[PDB]
Amino acid sequence: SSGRIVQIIGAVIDVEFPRDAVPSIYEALKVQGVETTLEVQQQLGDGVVRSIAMGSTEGLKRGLNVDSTGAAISVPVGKATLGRIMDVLGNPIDEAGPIGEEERWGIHREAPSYADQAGGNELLETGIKVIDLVCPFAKGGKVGLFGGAGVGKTVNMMELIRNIAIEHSGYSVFAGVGERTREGNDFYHEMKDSNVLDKVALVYGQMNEPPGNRLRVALTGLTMAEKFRDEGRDVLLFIDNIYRYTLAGTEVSALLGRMPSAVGYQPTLAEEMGVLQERITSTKKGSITSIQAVYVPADDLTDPSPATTFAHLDATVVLSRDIASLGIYPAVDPLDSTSRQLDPLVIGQDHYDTARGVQYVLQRYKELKDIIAILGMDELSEADKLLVARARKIQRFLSQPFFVAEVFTGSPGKYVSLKDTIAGFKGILNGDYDHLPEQAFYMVGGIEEAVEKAKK
Amino acid sequence: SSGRIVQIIGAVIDVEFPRDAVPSIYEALKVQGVETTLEVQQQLGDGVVRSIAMGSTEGLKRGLNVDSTGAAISVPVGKATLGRIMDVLGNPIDEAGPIGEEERWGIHREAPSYADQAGGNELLETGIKVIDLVCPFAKGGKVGLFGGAGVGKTVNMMELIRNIAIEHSGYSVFAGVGERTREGNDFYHEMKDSNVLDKVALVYGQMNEPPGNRLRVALTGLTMAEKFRDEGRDVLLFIDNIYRYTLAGTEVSALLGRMPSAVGYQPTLAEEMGVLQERITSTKKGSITSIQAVYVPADDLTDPSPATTFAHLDATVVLSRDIASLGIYPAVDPLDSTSRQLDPLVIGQDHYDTARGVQYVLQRYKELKDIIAILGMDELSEADKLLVARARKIQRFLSQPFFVAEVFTGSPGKYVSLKDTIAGFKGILNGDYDHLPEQAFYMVGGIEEAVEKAKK
Amino acid sequence: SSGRIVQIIGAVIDVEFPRDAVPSIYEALKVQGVETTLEVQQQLGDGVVRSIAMGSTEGLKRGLNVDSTGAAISVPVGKATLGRIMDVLGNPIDEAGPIGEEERWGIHREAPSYADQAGGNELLETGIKVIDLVCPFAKGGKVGLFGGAGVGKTVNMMELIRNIAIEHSGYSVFAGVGERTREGNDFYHEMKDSNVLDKVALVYGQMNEPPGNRLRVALTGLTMAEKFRDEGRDVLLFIDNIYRYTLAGTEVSALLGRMPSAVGYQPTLAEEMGVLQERITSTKKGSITSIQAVYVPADDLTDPSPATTFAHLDATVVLSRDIASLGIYPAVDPLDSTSRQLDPLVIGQDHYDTARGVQYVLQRYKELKDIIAILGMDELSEADKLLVARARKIQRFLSQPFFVAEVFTGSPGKYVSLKDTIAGFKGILNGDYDHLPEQAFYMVGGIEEAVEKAKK
Amino acid sequence: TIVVAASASESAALQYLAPYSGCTMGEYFRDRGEDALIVYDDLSKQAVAYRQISLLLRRPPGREAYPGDVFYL
Amino acid sequence: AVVENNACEQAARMIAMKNATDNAGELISDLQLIYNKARQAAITQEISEIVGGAAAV
Numbered sequence A, B, C: 001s002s003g004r005i006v007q008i009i010g011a012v013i014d015v016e017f018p019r020d021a022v023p024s025i026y027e028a029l030k031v032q033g034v035e036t037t038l039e040v041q042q043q044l045g046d047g048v049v050r051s052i053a054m055g056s057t058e059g060l061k062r063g064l065n066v067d068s069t070g071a072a073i074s075v076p077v078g079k080a081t082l083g084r085i086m087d088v089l090g091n092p093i094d095e096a097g098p099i100g101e102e103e104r105w106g107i108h109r110e111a112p113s114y115a116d117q118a119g120g121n122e123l124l125e126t127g128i129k130v131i132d133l134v135c136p137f138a139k140g141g142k143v144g145l146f147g148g149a150g151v152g153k154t155v156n157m158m159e160l161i162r163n164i165a166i167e168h169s170g171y172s173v174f175a176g177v178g179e180r181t182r183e184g185n186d187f188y189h190e191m192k193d194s195n196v197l198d199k200v201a202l203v204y205g206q207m208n209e210p211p212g213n214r215l216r217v218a219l220t221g222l223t224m225a226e227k228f229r230d231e232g233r234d235v236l237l238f239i240d241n242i243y244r245y246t247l248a249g250t251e252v253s254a255l256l257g258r259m260p261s262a263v264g265y266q267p268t269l270a271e272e273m274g275v276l277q278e279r280i281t282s283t284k285k286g287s288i289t290s291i292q293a294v295y296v297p298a299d300d301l302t303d304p305s306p307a308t309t310f311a312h313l314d315a316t317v318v319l320s321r322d323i324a325s326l327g328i329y330p331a332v333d334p335l336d337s338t339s340r341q342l343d344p345l346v347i348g349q350d351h352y353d354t355a356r357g358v359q360y361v362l363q364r365y366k367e368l369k370d371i372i373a374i375l376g377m378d379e380l381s382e383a384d385k386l387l388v389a390r391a392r393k394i395q396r397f398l399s400q401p402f403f404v405a406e407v408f409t410g411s412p413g414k415y416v417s418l419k420d421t422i423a424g425f426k427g428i429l430n431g432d433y434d435h436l437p438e439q440a441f442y443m444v445g446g447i448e449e450a451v452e453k454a455k456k
Numbered sequence D: 001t002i003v004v005a006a007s008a009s010e011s012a013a014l015q016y017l018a019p020y021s022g023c024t025m026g027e028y029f030r031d032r033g034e035d036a037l038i039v040y041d042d043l044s045k046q047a048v049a050y051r052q053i054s055l056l057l058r059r060p061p062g063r064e065a066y067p068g069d070v071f072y073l
Numbered sequence E: 001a002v003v004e005n006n007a008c009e010q011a012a013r014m015i016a017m018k019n020a021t022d023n024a025g026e027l028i029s030d031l032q033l034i035y036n037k038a039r040q041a042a043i044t045q046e047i048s049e050i051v052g053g054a055a056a057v
């Protein structure tokens, strides 16, 4: 049946329905004669429901007829979503026609049960040396990405999108939570030019959209990722900024009139984060792994938003402006970046000792560099100068030419295995390559390629 | 028609009138029997108006009949107001009987239009070294004396009144808003004993008066100044504390049914301030030169009230508690004070370079102060040791004995001309006085008196 | 007559009675089917009263009958309470049978009048060096032990119970307000095994209890003590934690329909404290020496509850988490702790000068902390270095092993007389001990033990 | 000396009114050509008593739950 | 002997100033935590006052 608009206050709209036809919480409603969607938030009673417009409310009036759809916001899922740009409701924002969908799924569901969890920890082989050695990702895990602009964040996402599809038969989904319209257009062309667009589904909630759109885009992208996982795949879910998901929840909570919590956040802060993060896991069919960019308010790591997010992160990848100047384009900081999987009871004693060996040598070199600067290179012992030489070789061997970066590097891309990554660094730590020049260990991929690059 | 009091709560009173005889916004009402005036602030509906008492409510009761006057508060204006002390309602508060008015104006009015504004840069000399150097005032300009409690706002204003109003050929309006009754008595006897009371109109609303009185006293004084400006005359308008106008609005805002904003202020803080401040201006008919003292709650210049006030003024003079705590008066901060006249095109290149030269030395001394505290003074360069000595001399050469402050210091007052100020600071910056001790520059006047003081 | 439960919200219950039979404020009511007791707080109108339950509300429902008792909560008083444990309602909770009461008193009374007050300046030696030096206690006066969580409040009270029962021959009353149930069991068996129990009355309302019990237990203990004071006896009234009486009031305040004050506290915060604190006094009939532990929320001494308590005490002992972190016990702050008895006319000049000298030394040492923190002790002046050395010795000489702490440490307890306390600190101030190492003063009781500790 | 007492156990109304009662007793000498001195041992406690009454009367709170007219007090 | 002691004075000072720089950073680190605690507390108090006044008006 149908109801009538009774009150309009900004993005908040109240609708009255017959006592026998009141729509459910989270049900999607359609205004007759206008392209406006309302998501139901609360049942006030006496037939009246409180909803949030998923669009602009300009030109709406009291008394307009509204229709119930019988289910939550339902979006297209499957193969047809690849290489397409969509809004929060699943509409094709690109001027490429209708999506060739075969099925539609509602955006709200429970996380997989206690019985649906996978039987252990399985690393996701990214094929990138520095990440697979120092920042090992677990399948079904959540990775926090930290750093400023112009440090390789976009190129690193495109390489991961290429490798999951070509080396693991998977797919990717990108959720633009509070996306800037200029950057959203630039990213779409960069992926078309890099030939990765047909391997990813793009869902954008732009900054100029109402709070309800920015809050639900993460669930729309997650619903598309859930479909591929059920197919029998390992999937990558990229979230453009997890802080903007928290802020959209704060904005919606204030519009609905709820009493604010500590530091002004919504009272539901931990539950809203848990509802999103608990769906990203390794099941008994497939595994959704997520890469999420993280923003820290006022540089305070104790602030409720950073605090809550860090509770669901399995790894932290930090991109460094200093490392980029050195010339290592991946730009991941081996000392600041960390992973909960860097444990001998998970990755075995060999991988753990090799990774901790690289971190120890790189720590000592950072201390020695201040000594060499303040007092001079002649002041160091013979053992310390030998360490400096191995540290420099390790530092350059952390570099790698990516297939999406051939335009910048002028060289073909490389996919190094975890086995080849461990063997190369273990050899340099033991001194098996002490005769080779450090440059021979720059932009080569596996350790056998350094040997030849040195031969010429 | 006639109305009945229906609700008294503190200074706010509700009056119910026939639904065909509801008085206008800002309309004045009179209580029957009791001598009390109420101004309509809001029309709640059903013939009821919300009003604020311009007196005490201890004698008011529910059911007292109230009369509609058909207009807003009408105060006497013109020549009859000179040499008289008056309240918010324009009644005489001196024993000299009634005022021979020939016209009454309404305290509420529109601000002059954009086409009526006038621009002038005539330099006005004050006789104070710090102001004449970094805050040069202009005829027809707006000046603000910003400061906390006990730093010199009243004293400095009295010195200006003496160095300007006494010589000023035109008329003058002095408005005491939320002032101490003792200061008002001392100033009245001072204007009367100095024979200058004949050219000064005095309006007083002290701290012992009801919120409504302190909320409209500024509009009464300004209405008298506007009558004189519109006659084509040049006028001086001195306001003792314009903060008391904002505070009276905060004290009454919550009882008027308004939700509070940041730092517990009325949600109408910026509009209530703009409506008053835009009338205090120099149009194309006559010129109002105005000096306002601005209280800074808890010495915090970021507080919403002080922060909203800076944009309304041409000259901003800042008084510092840290300078006053060192026994240095006037306690003007030469790094936070500013004027639109501090421009090479208006004041000349020599004055401008001397002012910027003094500010550069003081900013450099502010950052060397911590070094000297922890390590000591011998660990500085020869250039820094010399700069610290000159900064301490400039900081003491800005102090000045005032004629209105002889009861507090015991020392005779001094008036320094702009030529003498520039010469004294240019000499200290150049090095012409690097032999005299820093104590020779404390409380003296012109640079010759520092030379005489040094010998003794 | 009989009323009906009309509303239930947590610990607060509304009951409706016939208009001619409405119970008075503080009247006790009993629920017919469960015998649960309720205390009337306010009369709401229409025959409805609001009350707090003196027990659990689980299982209660609307429509149950309620009986008015015609009087306030009345508890047994006199000799029959000695060596017995009671709850908030005066029921025995020690399994030893009924109390042989001759009379009962209501728990609400007015404080004694101005003309029934008594002045006590007789010093009460505690045996603790820090307290006997800077916080001298007096017979018939009030003491407050202020401190954060786990800083020493209960340990310092148990030591004061042990060393004050040496000279005192009368009765004691102990009120356990919202503290650990294990600590009440430990104290009861300790006194029972030591044969001290027949001179102490015990009342409990611990952390396990509902809000109504924790809110009224303090009144029940004080009422029994008042019976002994008014029989012309010298009594000791010990309160396990006075902050819990105020906190139980905060949990119930919003349910009583009151608007909250600063940091969520009840608007009635200072009156509730005074109404209980004023009754705890030495009248002309008898004396009530009282020692109260005062909890400090999140270590903030500026919090409204601790801030409001200081004015009700004769001696203030302020414990600190920093002093406790260095190893010192008792962790008293000599600079924050004070007493009304620290006067030359009460204690003599010699003790007063020793205390003034100790404080002067520590105050200067506190001021040099930041300089030593960045540059170390070696840059201080010759005199400064000497003070820093005496300040460090005075600090460890304020440490003392207690007889209630030999179980925690294993070292034996020490009792130090006032004469030995003055002599030890006077010697350290004069420089008579400048040749001993600092660690010869830590936990040494008397100064002679420091001389014998320095031999190792 | 005249001593005016409104102790900690007395009604918040008596603590709120005590400074005005003492002021009125001092004003008797002022109005008759004599000199007087008055000490208010704690105006911060008078403000806390006024805040209690105002919150129980359900008047809207200000800057630290204090009444809007605490300056005028 | 004098000249060698001057070389020792310079080296000793190098170490003293390194220690002082490190100690300063530790104090900055501790103060920044107290500052963040004060920043968060100021926001919660203001919101309570805004909500409290709006729940009356």
Ligand SMILES: Nc1ncnc2c1ncn2[C@@H]1O[C@H](COP(=O)(O)OP(=O)(O)O)[C@@H](O)[C@H]1O
Pocket (backbone or CB within 6 Å): A148, A149, A150, A151, A152, A153, A154, A155, A156, A329, A330, A402, A405, A408, A409
């Ligand atoms: N892997 C790479 N190989 C070579 N150059 C790179 C690489 N990653 C980043 N860069 C350089 O850094 C620039 C910015 O990288 P990008 O991924 O777009 O960072 P961001 O998205 O923050 O702007 C690139 O245009 C390129 O010049």
Ligand SMILES: Nc1ncnc2c1ncn2[C@@H]1O[C@H](COP(=O)(O)OP(=O)(O)O)[C@@H](O)[C@H]1O
Pocket (backbone or CB within 6 Å): B147, B148, B149, B150, B151, B152, B153, B154, B155, B156, B329, B330, B402, B405, B408, B409
């Ligand atoms: N120029 C000055 N010279 C000497 N003392 C001064 C001067 N200005 C202020 N003071 C001191 O401070 C008081 C003036 O403060 P006042 O002008 O009333 O400050 P405000 O109006 O900012 O509260 C004097 O009583 C005196 O003690």
Ligand SMILES: Nc1ncnc2c1ncn2[C@@H]1O[C@H](COP(=O)(O)OP(=O)(O)O)[C@@H](O)[C@H]1O
Pocket (backbone or CB within 6 Å): C147, C148, C149, C150, C151, C152, C153, C154, C155, C156, C179, C240, C241, C293, C329, C330, C405, C408
């Ligand atoms: N030697 C000590 N002397 C005093 N207090 C100590 C000592 N060592 C540790 N503390 C701790 O102080 C606690 C008691 O004080 P506190 O926690 O402040 O009292 P409360 O139980 O009332 O909260 C003890 O249980 C003990 O663990």
Ligand SMILES: [Mg+2]
Pocket (backbone or CB within 6 Å): B153, B154
């Ligand atoms: Mg003043």
Ligand SMILES: [Mg+2]
Pocket (backbone or CB within 6 Å): C154, C179, C180, C183
């Ligand atoms: Mg305890």
